[PDB]
Amino acid sequence: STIPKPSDQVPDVDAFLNKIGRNCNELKDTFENNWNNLFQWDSKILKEKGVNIQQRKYILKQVHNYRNNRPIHEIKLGKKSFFGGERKRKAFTAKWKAENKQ
Amino acid sequence: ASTGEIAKAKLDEFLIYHKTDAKLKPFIYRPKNAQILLTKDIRDPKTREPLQPRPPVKPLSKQTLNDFIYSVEPNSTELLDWFKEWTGTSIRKRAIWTYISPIHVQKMLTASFFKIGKYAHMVGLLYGIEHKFLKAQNPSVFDIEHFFNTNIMCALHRNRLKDYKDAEIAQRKLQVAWKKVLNRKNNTGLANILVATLGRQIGFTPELTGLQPVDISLPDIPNSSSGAELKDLLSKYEGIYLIARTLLDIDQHNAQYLELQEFIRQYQNALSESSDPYDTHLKALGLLETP
Amino acid sequence: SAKAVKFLKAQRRKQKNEAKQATLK
Amino acid sequence: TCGLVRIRLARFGRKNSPVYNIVVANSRKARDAKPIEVLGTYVPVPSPVTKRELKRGVVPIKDVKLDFDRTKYWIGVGAQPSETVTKLLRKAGILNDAWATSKNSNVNRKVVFERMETLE
RNA sequence: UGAUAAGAUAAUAAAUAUGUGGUGUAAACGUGAGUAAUUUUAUUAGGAAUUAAUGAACUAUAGAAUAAGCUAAAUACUUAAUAUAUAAAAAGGAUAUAUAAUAUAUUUAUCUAUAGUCAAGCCAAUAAUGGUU
RNA sequence: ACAUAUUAUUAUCUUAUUAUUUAUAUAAUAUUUUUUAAUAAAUUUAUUAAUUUAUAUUUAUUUAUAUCAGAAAU
Ligand SMILES: [K+]
Ligand SMILES: [K+]
Ligand SMILES: [K+]
Ligand SMILES: [Mg+2]
Ligand SMILES: [Mg+2]
Ligand SMILES: [Mg+2]
Ligand SMILES: [Mg+2]
Ligand SMILES: [Mg+2]
Ligand SMILES: [Mg+2]
Ligand SMILES: [Mg+2]
Ligand SMILES: [Mg+2]
Ligand SMILES: [Mg+2]
């Protein structure tokens, strides 16, 4: 679509790649701090630039959010419980309560 | 061993009892269930040995906390740590939140200033925890005869000892103190005298809403000389002896009032055989100032 | 036994009916 | 989507050539299990328009067959359409803008052609 | 705020799902061991006992949402109050605004009742491999 | 013959667990109930620990019946 305008919280692409997170700060060299490249490159271009499947989809979701004045704060992917997944929690908990508290 | 050590053990036993779970209270404190407790083998928190029977706990005496207050070393955080643990209990434990009386807070504020030397951190624990007292249905503790007067009295000594003379800080602090009072019942009338003395000392005109003029009504201890009845009566009126002696010593304007001197005569002559409360505290303030 | 008392009660009932058939026939 | 009775797409066809049944189904049953009712069919692949037609102004058409009357009955009894089915029903004029969401709300987009009900 | 800084209070911005809680796993998926039918299958314009104060979870409508206790605290749990012979309930959170914790408003939940939708229990008739050595 | 494996059955033996049903407790908890100390507050009342009292809910043991399973016989 159109190119949004830089804000004060997200002045440049590097700030954009740091707020979204998910290790997207490791693509700062792919974009070269070019604001237009971030808001013009689609999936096909990003795939040719070496961005993996998960990251390029995540970036494009945050680019759409920015274009619509929606928050771009990092949302973390889900993680299994400390005591393991439900299917292996009974076993893990039994072996963790006999080696920590006896 | 010492009076303080014994009092602390009694106060710590009382708290442990009321902080125990209700289901487990009959099995840990009723001696007839000592064998039922063993069999259940409930495991003491902190992964310690199974819980063991404890002696039944009976209502604690209000004098117990007065003994602990006056045992705290000259520069210690023991009173400040006990209060923070005592007032950290749930507001549903009525025994814990009703044990504290107006006398206890007066003795916690007068001991902290003249003996323990941590007044600032004792007026912050009381100011900070006043909201919990209201939720725990014990607002009376924050009154004018034990909380406000004691505070203004310690101010009339710190402002001198330290020489503080700002007329803005004093007024702001005086307003906060009055705002912290939840049981505004001026009886002795010493509050008005204390507030006026503060203004003269720090060169401002006090003006607090609701502090209506009250004539002096100092309780006169009778000439009759009893034993534990007059030792309690003196200890009962010990706070107002520290306020009468303070008023005269700080400012000579209070010498005008002759009611103040009558109480001094009565309280001093009542047990002049023993030491002087006012002087005793003054000595410590110097012994704490030197450090 | 409770199972030996139930068995005999049923065995007597079956034998009364087998006899009943003979008396009817 | 919520509820026990949902209007959703059941997948038919072959690999790489999906076609869908518009069905009323119990939430807990398999996607392609025999539903309560088959309301219609959805072919997601638009009909290809020829070079001339494109310049002529023909827009590719996606074809949906639907029982309008029966569909309205199931909405009336509290059946809950899926997001994709909701889009289809809003385009057909059965559902209105009350079923739109914040992400797809076309509050400001020009209308090039207005919904036209005809007979054929 | 605390006359010296330990703490408290509120606002804002974050963190925590190794604490207490809620919802979810009777489904789907896989398999064909058992099962020859008081149980399983299929069928019928079948039936009654003439099927619950059951909603499981959405729809429409109406009303309600009270007091204590227990836990560190609660939309946890327990005991009560009031609600279709009558019986049988509940829960707040978020955000604004005005007040001196309370009230409204918005939003999202909780409980009850009536109907609908989905969905259940039971029975009959008919048929369902081989051997009478 | 028979040595094996599998299954089923029982007027038999043993039996986990559970359901139901007995008897018992100076059993626990709550409330009621009879008193009794200790403590506290106030200047009788409250709390805690006991005792008496019934009530409900549990717990332990116990009686009987059924029961996974195993043994024996067929
Ligand atoms: K498989
Ligand atoms: K099979
Ligand atoms: K609300
Ligand atoms: Mg958790
Ligand atoms: Mg299943
Ligand atoms: Mg379940
Ligand atoms: Mg498959
Ligand atoms: Mg309520
Ligand atoms: Mg509550
Ligand atoms: Mg609940
Ligand atoms: Mg033969
Ligand atoms: Mg058997």
UniProtKB/Swiss-Prot annotation, chain A:
One of its GO terms (molecular function) is structural constituent of ribosome. It is found in: Mitochondrion. Keywords: Mitochondrion, Ribonucleoprotein, Ribosomal protein, Transit peptide. Its main location: mitochondrion. Transmembrane segments: none annotated. GO terms for biological process: mitochondrial translation. GO terms for cellular component: mitochondrial inner membrane; mitochondrial small ribosomal subunit; mitochondrion. Present with 2630 molecules/cell in log phase SD medium. Component of the mitochondrial ribosome (mitoribosome), a dedicated translation machinery responsible for the synthesis of mitochondrial genome-encoded proteins, including at least some of the essential transmembrane subunits of the mitochondrial respiratory chain. The mitoribosomes are attached to the mitochondrial inner membrane and translation products are cotranslationally integrated into the membrane. mS41 is involved in telomere length regulation and required for survival upon exposure to K1 killer toxin. Component of the mitochondrial small ribosomal subunit (mt-SSU). Mature yeast 74S mitochondrial ribosomes consist of a small (37S) and a large (54S) subunit. The 37S small subunit contains a 15S ribosomal RNA (15S mt-rRNA) and 34 different proteins. The 54S large subunit contains a 21S rRNA (21S mt-rRNA) and 46 different proteins. Belongs to the mitochondrion-specific ribosomal protein mS41 family. This is Small ribosomal subunit protein mS41.
From Swiss-Prot, chain B:
Keywords: Mitochondrion, Ribonucleoprotein, Ribosomal protein, Transit peptide. GO terms for molecular function: structural constituent of ribosome. GO terms for cellular component: mitochondrial inner membrane; mitochondrial small ribosomal subunit; mitochondrion. GO terms for biological process: mitochondrial translation. Coiled coil: none annotated. It is found in: Mitochondrion. The keyword Disulfide bond does not apply. Present with 16000 molecules/cell in log phase SD medium. Component of the mitochondrial ribosome (mitoribosome), a dedicated translation machinery responsible for the synthesis of mitochondrial genome-encoded proteins, including at least some of the essential transmembrane subunits of the mitochondrial respiratory chain. The mitoribosomes are attached to the mitochondrial inner membrane and translation products are cotranslationally integrated into the membrane. Component of the mitochondrial small ribosomal subunit (mt-SSU). Mature yeast 74S mitochondrial ribosomes consist of a small (37S) and a large (54S) subunit. The 37S small subunit contains a 15S ribosomal RNA (15S mt-rRNA) and 34 different proteins. The 54S large subunit contains a 21S rRNA (21S mt-rRNA) and 46 different proteins. Belongs to the mitochondrion-specific ribosomal protein mS27 family. This is Small ribosomal subunit protein mS27.
Curated annotation (Swiss-Prot), chain C:
The precursor is processed in two steps involving mitochondrial intermediate peptidase (MIP) and mitochondrial processing peptidase (MPP). It comes from the Eukaryota. It is found in: Mitochondrion. Component of the mitochondrial small ribosomal subunit (mt-SSU). Mature yeast 74S mitochondrial ribosomes consist of a small (37S) and a large (54S) subunit. The 37S small subunit contains a 15S ribosomal RNA (15S mt-rRNA) and 34 different proteins. The 54S large subunit contains a 21S rRNA (21S mt-rRNA) and 46 different proteins. Present with 6960 molecules/cell in log phase SD medium. Component of the mitochondrial ribosome (mitoribosome), a dedicated translation machinery responsible for the synthesis of mitochondrial genome-encoded proteins, including at least some of the essential transmembrane subunits of the mitochondrial respiratory chain. The mitoribosomes are attached to the mitochondrial inner membrane and translation products are cotranslationally integrated into the membrane. Belongs to the universal ribosomal protein uS15 family. This is Small ribosomal subunit protein uS15m. The chain holds residues 34 to 58 of 286 of the full protein.
Swiss-Prot record, chain D:
Keywords: Mitochondrion, Ribonucleoprotein, Ribosomal protein. InterPro entries: Ribosomal_bS16, Ribosomal_bS16_CS, Ribosomal_bS16_dom_sf. SUPFAM superfamilies: Ribosomal protein S16. Gene3D superfamilies: 3.30.1320.10. GO terms for biological process: mitochondrial translation. It is found in: Mitochondrion. It comes from the Eukaryota. Coiled coil: none annotated. One of its GO terms (cellular component) is mitochondrial small ribosomal subunit. GO terms for molecular function: structural constituent of ribosome. Its main location: mitochondrion. Pfam families: Ribosomal_S16. Component of the mitochondrial ribosome (mitoribosome), a dedicated translation machinery responsible for the synthesis of mitochondrial genome-encoded proteins, including at least some of the essential transmembrane subunits of the mitochondrial respiratory chain. The mitoribosomes are attached to the mitochondrial inner membrane and translation products are cotranslationally integrated into the membrane. HAMAP family: Ribosomal_bS16. Belongs to the bacterial ribosomal protein bS16 family. PANTHER family: 30S RIBOSOMAL PROTEIN S16, SMALL RIBOSOMAL SUBUNIT PROTEIN BS16M. Component of the mitochondrial small ribosomal subunit (mt-SSU). Mature yeast 74S mitochondrial ribosomes consist of a small (37S) and a large (54S) subunit. The 37S small subunit contains a 15S ribosomal RNA (15S mt-rRNA) and 34 different proteins. The 54S large subunit contains a 21S rRNA (21S mt-rRNA) and 46 different proteins. This is Small ribosomal subunit protein bS16m. The gene is MRPS16.
